[PDB]
Amino acid sequence: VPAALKRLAKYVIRGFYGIEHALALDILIRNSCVKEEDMLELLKFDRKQLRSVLNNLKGDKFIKCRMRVETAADGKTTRHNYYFINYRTLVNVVKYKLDHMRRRIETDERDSTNRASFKCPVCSSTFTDLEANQLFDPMTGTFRCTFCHTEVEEDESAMPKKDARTLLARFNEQIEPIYALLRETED
Amino acid sequence: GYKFGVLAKIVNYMKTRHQRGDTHPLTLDEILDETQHLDIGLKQKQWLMTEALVNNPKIEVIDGKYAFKPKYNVRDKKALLRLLDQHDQRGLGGILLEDIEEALPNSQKAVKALGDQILFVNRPDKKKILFFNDKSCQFSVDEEFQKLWRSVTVDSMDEEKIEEYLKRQGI
Ligand SMILES: [Zn+2]
């Protein structure tokens, strides 16, 4: 197990997840296979809040689980859940989450232009630019909504695009060390 | 009752004696003078010497005399930072806020002095558990990145869509 896989796992569990997820992954860094009951008594967390975290890590499939059954000294059977880290699946879901967030950038750029620009303050409903011509009355000579009959201002739709554009530069800058970790772990 | 009730009165007496500033250790008979237990049994005396004052993690021995343990408990900010760093390095888990409050009087001053060094986790029964802020990796994002990350759901989707999406985008 190379230490570069552990370094990238820490950098994605401390920034994109809470401190409870980071402490759970640090245990799996030290020991490859950790029993559930050992880590219950280690972090002394509540039973319900800790199993929900492991349900979340099973949701993102960062780690895998195996189940074994055995008979104890008293004769009562037990079902201990054994959890082990799998970096082969971990790198794929990180890469999948990276391209999904990357493809989210252009489709947010497209939906910024495809968003509505005509808004009526009376009915508080967005109006399509194509539908604004349909609502226009040729007899009146000026454009209004049919239902509300009020003036339409398009200046409200300009300001959410500029906020998204400035966040494009910050998102590209904060992701470069994560991309550098992927390139160093292609072997 | 006998042999199982006088030990609570003894440990309450020397704890309150330590609260008055009595750092110097005391002998067994000196404690027994003010606890009104002069008629205590001799077999109780030998049981206290060999079991009670050595298994208790609040009692330490100096030259055969017993006293409180202020070094193990937290009494200043520097020992709180050192102990919390040791629990982070060895991975022994956090310490409840009530344990620090009873060990360290006026512990709110030490909490506000350290500030962001102590991480607080709110238990459902109002209790708080303290954790070390390991400042080797401090990455934070805006709240709009958090709700966008929560918007995309992967728990209710099979693994065949994850593997196909890699080839769909051509990576
Ligand atoms: Zn209208």
Say if residues B93 and B87 touch (Cβ distance below 8 Å).
yes
B14 and B61 co-located in one domain: yes
Last residue of a domain, one of B60, B75, B90: B75
Q: What's the sign of the alpha-carbon dihedral A165, A166, A167, A170?
A: positive
- Are residues A46 and B91, on separate chains, in Cβ contact within 8 Å? no
- Are residues A95 and B171, on separate chains, in Cβ contact within 8 Å? yes
Q: List the strands of the sheet with B95-96, edge to edge.
A: B95-96, B128-132, B118-122
Give which of A96, A147, A93, A155 is closest to A125, Cα–Cα: A147
Residue B29 makes CB contacts below 8 A (sequence gap 6+) with none
Distance from CA of B133 to the nearest CA of A (A): 9
Give which of B146, B30, B32, B164 is closest to A101, Cα–Cα: B146
Tell me which method was used to determine the 3D structure.
Answer: cryo-EM
- Are residues B91 and A27, on separate chains, in Cβ contact within 8 Å? yes
B112 and B157 co-located in one domain: no
B66 and B84 co-located in one domain: no
Tokens 């890469």, residue located: A95
Extract the runs of DSSP E, i.e. beta strands, from B13-166.
59-62, 65-68, 95-96, 118-122, 128-132
How far is residue A55's CA from residue A10's CA, in Å, rounded to a whole number? 19
- Structural domain of B55: 4-75
For A93, which residue in chain B has the nearest alpha carbon?
B162
B66 and B100 co-located in one domain: no
* DSSP state, residue B76: S
B84 and B125 co-located in one domain: yes
B70 and B13 co-located in one domain: yes
Last residue of a domain, one of B75, B99, B123: B75
B119 and B148 co-located in one domain: no
B119 and B101 co-located in one domain: yes
Distance from CA of B92 to the nearest CA of A (A): 6
For A23, which residue in chain B has the nearest alpha carbon?
B91
Residues of A in contact with B169 (CB under 8 A): 99, 103
Show contacts of A142-148: CB within 8 Å, 24+ apart: A145/A120, A147/A123, A148/A120, A148/A122, A148/A123
Q: Domain count for chain B, please give it.
A: 3
How many CB atoms sit inside 10 A of residue B68's CB? 20
- Are residues B154 and A95, on separate chains, in Cβ contact within 8 Å? no
B19 and B30 co-located in one domain: yes
B125 and B139 co-located in one domain: no
How far is residue A128's CA from residue A134's CA, in Å, rounded to a whole number? 10
B161 and B120 co-located in one domain: no
How far is residue B5's CA from residue B52's CA, in Å, rounded to a whole number? 13
How far is residue A146's CA from residue A139's CA, in Å, rounded to a whole number? 13
How many CB atoms sit inside 10 A of residue A8's CB? 22
B118 and B153 co-located in one domain: no
Q: Tokens standing for B171?
A: 């990576």
User: Is A43 an interface residue toward B (CB < 8 Å)?
Assistant: yes
Grouping H, G, I as helix, E, B as strand and the rest as coil, residue A78 is strand
